Design a protein around this ligand. Structure first.
Ligand SMILES: O=c1ccn([C@@H]2O[C@H](COP(=O)(O)OP(=O)(O)O[C@H]3O[C@H](CO)[C@H](O)[C@H](O)[C@H]3O)[C@@H](O)[C@H]2O)c(=O)[nH]1
Ligand SMILES: O=c1ccn([C@@H]2O[C@H](COP(=O)(O)OP(=O)(O)O[C@H]3O[C@H](CO)[C@H](O)[C@H](O)[C@H]3O)[C@@H](O)[C@H]2O)c(=O)[nH]1
Ligand SMILES: [Mg+2]
Ligand SMILES: [Mg+2]
Lengths: 214, 214
């Protein structure tokens, strides 16, 4: 049964087409998961499932939609008692031999105990940064002077174990409004020194966000 | 009028020799700044200048020393009324024509007024997150499964304006004990556009940390 889910706004035609292209090109099955967007449904879900996050001003409603989308997929993994689920965001580009990693789960099943608490990142692992070209301050000795900003780290491609899905659901439900942070910080950065929770990284990575590739 | 300071533990003979080699090779003047290490001197400086950081258990005393070292150099920029100061950490490797940037300052003077609030990063901006090898779970299709151990950003090579030295001193003094993080993490989080503080990036970069080179 299919374990690959791609989080995507139902109306995002171009992204969905780019996702269909790449997955079918390598014969990798997947299903779209309709992303939560600023809407009655998202407001309602925040209220019932994560009231703490509803009251948090530090995240935009779009960031809250993305968070809700990952959260409800973790909940699907638990409710359906899946060993793991593999989640993507809809701007990913698949690397060369991605079919070997994503089309079948045997390689995971022989490696991991899925009751253990872990996430395996599939995407690139550079520190999350973006450059903005600017024209007003001229280059020197053939080097540009760009404007550097930080952004949130990627949650665009990962395998999550049933163990970690339970752990992250419990954690998100327990966080106070004040403790709410971007999904990547809670999932990755804030767990780096946790007892049971491991973050693994496929190295080299097998997928990359389109923006990150630039 | 020397602008270049290299943060280095006084006893780190090999790093200092590698720094002398590269800087003298390109005729770039510089001074070592004796890095603060776990010691009475560091404890004293933390107490006088950053009591908030003294009380932070989330950081090792070495991380506190590194932070104090950058902080006191920012303070020297202001106290000595330098236009800017250029800071390095002692594992840096200089690229080809670094002398054009580091031995002369007119290029900076014609681009900026030094009471503008900016940092210009000189080191690489593509920086992998820190991964740790593990042996208990075998690789698949020539990809390793590594463990995420930290997300550190480089503070090994940058120009800071007197404007930004004042801004960063004020910011560091204002952080609560709870908000204290390693210097690179704080500075990483300051790279945003909703500020008067700008971070520029030299592209391509002119230096790299030797460990990063892999
Ligand atoms: O209202 C929305 C808007 C977007 N998304 C979804 O969010 C995902 C990522 O979209 P983008 O690539 O446009 O956004 P980013 O890659 O910039 O988001 C990145 O940074 C975010 C914070 O700004 C998150 O923390 C996240 O880890 C990370 O992938 C997509 O699947 C998209 O469908 C929603 O679920 N709801
Ligand atoms: O007690 C100490 C130890 C080190 N340093 C200074 O810290 C700088 C960086 O030292 P290393 O490269 O040995 O430390 P890391 O290998 O940890 O360096 C990188 O990794 C760190 C992650 O913990 C930080 O992000 C740091 O800024 C980053 O450049 C050097 O100038 C060193 O002199 C001190 O001031 N005091
Ligand atoms: Mg993205
Ligand atoms: Mg270093």
């Amino acid at each position: 049964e299919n374990k690959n889910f791609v989080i995507s706004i139902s109306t995002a035609e171009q992204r969905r087409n780019h996702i269909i292209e790449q997955f079918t090109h390598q014969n990798i099955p997947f299903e779209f998961f309709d992303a939560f967007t600023p809407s009655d449904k998202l407001t309602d879900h925040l209220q019932r499932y994560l009231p703490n996050v509803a009251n948090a001003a530090q995240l935009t409603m779009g960031e809250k939609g993305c968070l809700m989308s990952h959260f409800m997929l973790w909940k699907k993994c638990i409710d359906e008692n899946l060993d793991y689920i593999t989640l993507f965001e809809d701007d990913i580009l698949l690397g060369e031999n991605a079919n070997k990693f994503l089309a079948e789960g045997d390689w995971l099943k022989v490696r991991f105990n899925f009751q253990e608490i872990f996430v395996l990142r599939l995407e690139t692992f550079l520190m999350p940064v973006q450059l903005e070209k600017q024209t007003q301050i001229p280059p020197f000795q053939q080097r540009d002077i760009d404007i550097l900003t930080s952004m949130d780290w990627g949650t665009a491609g990962y395998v999550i174990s049933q163990g970690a899905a339970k752990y992250l659901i419990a954690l998100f439900e327990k966080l106070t409004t004040e403790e709410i942070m971007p999904i990547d910080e809670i999932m990755f950065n804030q767990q780096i020194n946790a007892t049971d929770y491991r973050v693994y990284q496929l190295n080299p990575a097998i997928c990359v966000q389109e923006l990150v590739l630039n």
